[PDB]
């Protein structure tokens, strides 16, 4: 778990309209685009990952947040690759902030998967038998990773903070440490533990997260083998 | 433990073809008189509900007041909107010298002696927030020292 020649992917990203505040983490422009300084990406990785063992080897939870289509898959993978929960499709307003409420939704999900196996499987107009199919359809379309979280997360690993601005904001209001693979286009100051590097690209997203997921297990006595998500990198 | 003073409750209204449609708002202060004060502004269909929601919001918005021998560590002047509140520390036996709003907060704050003055807009709601805000900025020679260490 590490590496410096991660020039193999991440580093520089985003044309040039940046966010002056991400100035520190930038190395320079080239053909137009900025270039994320990896040596720093390192300094941060350490600090960040550390904070994760701590959280991990403590039985602490970490809500993985990835709406960005460019990582939508990698997020399910890695998140599932640990008892960790995730928000994959749309980040519903108040998941963190209005949790006890959005929970009632995860309750319904379960309370439904029941009926669809119980004695009433075939009861009441197939119309309702259809509307309920739907009830689940969507319920499962957004609460498949948010499934787990029985209480508010102890932290949050966000793919692209900017894109995930709301997720972040909420956590903050709740003093829920915020971690995120963010780059040029974002406000670094709103991130507690930063991984400055390509907010886009799978070849990048895949690495950082997976390594971070490993690090979780490599701190939970699971000492698991290679990631099944490298497959989604072609 | 937590005492609860209700500042003001007002009625207010919204319009709909067919009639006025009111909803009440209540400003609530909550403190333990120890050094914890909480301000909350909750609105709702009926007064009771409003007051409750307010207490709820208040407890969820506490401030740590640096009470030093019943008074405050130093003068503060906070401007919240058109409202400006002034806080001056006072010796024992001075009592709480302040308007109904700043007072009510200062008291559940556990403050026993202070000099006060509302300048500018005297809107309870905005004065209230100003007061809270003033307390939030109160510092101790300790913190001041702490901040200028290194």
């Amino acid at each position: 778990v590490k590496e410096l020649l991660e020039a193999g992917v991440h580093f520089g990203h985003e044309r040039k309209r940046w966010n002056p505040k991400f100035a520190r983490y930038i190395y320079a422009e080239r053909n137009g685009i900025h270039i994320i300084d990896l040596q720093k990406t390192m300094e941060e990785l350490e600090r960040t990952f550390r904070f994760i063992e701590d959280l991990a080897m403590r039985g602490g939870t970490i809500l993985f947040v990835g709406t960005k289509k460019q990582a939508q898959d990698i997020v399910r993978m890695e998140a599932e690759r640990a008892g960790m929960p995730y928000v994959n499709q749309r980040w519903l307003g108040g998941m963190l902030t209005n949790f006890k409420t959005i929970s009632q939704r995860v309750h319904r999900l379960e309370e439904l998967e029941a009926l669809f196996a119980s004695p009433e499987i075939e009861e009441r107009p197939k119309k309702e038998q259809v509307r309920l199919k739907h009830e689940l359809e969507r319920l499962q379309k957004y609460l498949s990773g948010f499934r787990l979280l029985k209480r508010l997360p102890d932290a949050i690993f966000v793919v692209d903070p900017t894109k995930e601005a709301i997720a972040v904001r909420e956590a903050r209001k709740l003093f829920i440490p915020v971690i995120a693979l963010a780059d040029t286009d974002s406000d670094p100051d709103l991130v507690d533990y930063i991984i400055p590097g390509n907010d886009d690209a799978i070849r990048s997203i895949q690495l950082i997260l997976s390594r971070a997921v490993d690090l979780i297990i490599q701190a939970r006595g699971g000492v698991v083998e290679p990631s099944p998500s490298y497959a989604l990198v072609q | 433990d937590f005492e609860e003073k209700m500042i003001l409750i007002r009625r207010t209204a919204r319009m709909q073809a067919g009639g006025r449609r009111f909803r009440f708002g209540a400003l609530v202060v909550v403190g333990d008189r120890q050094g914890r004060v909480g301000l909350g502004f909750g609105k709702a269909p009926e007064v009771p509900l409003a007051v409750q929601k307010a207490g709820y919001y208040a407890r969820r918005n506490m401030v740590e007041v640096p009470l030093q021998n019943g008074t405050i560590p130093h003068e503060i002047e906070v401007e919240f909107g058109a409202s400006k509140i002034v806080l001056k520390p006072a010796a024992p036996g001075t009592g709480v010298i302040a308007g109904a709003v700043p007072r009510a907060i200062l008291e559940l704050a556990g403050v026993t002696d202070i000099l006060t003055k509302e300048l500018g807009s005297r809107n309870p709601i905005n004065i209230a927030y100003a007061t809270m805000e003033a307390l939030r900025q109160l510092r101790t020679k300790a913190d001041v020292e702490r901040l200028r260490k290194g």
């Binding site: 003093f175 709103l190 507690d192 | 130093h74 003068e75 020679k141 901040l147």
Partner: protein
């Protein structure tokens, strides 16, 4: 022209610190440097050093801040919550040693300029003297 140098400096400082600059330049002058000396001493700034910008002498003023904060707006608490000119040209303000104010119940300071140099208020009071009330800071 640059109407009031001392204000111009306090302001630059006020402005830089407000957006959290690390350092910040100001056209050097003995008098200005002297004030910073107190600024540094009282621990309001990390300190300063004489530099040369485009050939002319300035003073980097290394700013200082509280630590990162929690929840929304992790922006640090200021070390210099305040800083204001008092004596201003076309309105000079002089005080007798008995008329020397006590900034923020002592938690803050005021910088006087006396015939015994530019001392703070405790320094002035101790040395039993008064002078121009340059500025308060807390």
């Amino acid at each position: 022209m640059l109407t009031d140098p001392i204000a111009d400096m306090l302001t630059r400082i006020r402005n830089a610190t407000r957006v959290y600059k690390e350092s910040t330049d100001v056209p050097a002058s003995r008098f200005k440097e002297e004030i910073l000396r107190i600024l540094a001493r009282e621990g309001f700034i990390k300190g300063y050093e004489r530099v040369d910008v485009d050939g002319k002498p300035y003073l980097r003023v290394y700013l200082k801040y509280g630590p990162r904060r929690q929840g929304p707006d992790p922006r640090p608490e200021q070390v210099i919550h305040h800083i204001r000119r008092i004596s201003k040209p076309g309105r000079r303000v002089y005080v007798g040693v008995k008329e020397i104010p006590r900034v923020r119940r002592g938690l803050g300071i005021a910088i006087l300029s006396t015939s015994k140099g530019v001392l703070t208020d405790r320094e002035a009071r101790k040395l039993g003297v008064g002078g121009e009330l340059i500025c308060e800071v807390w």
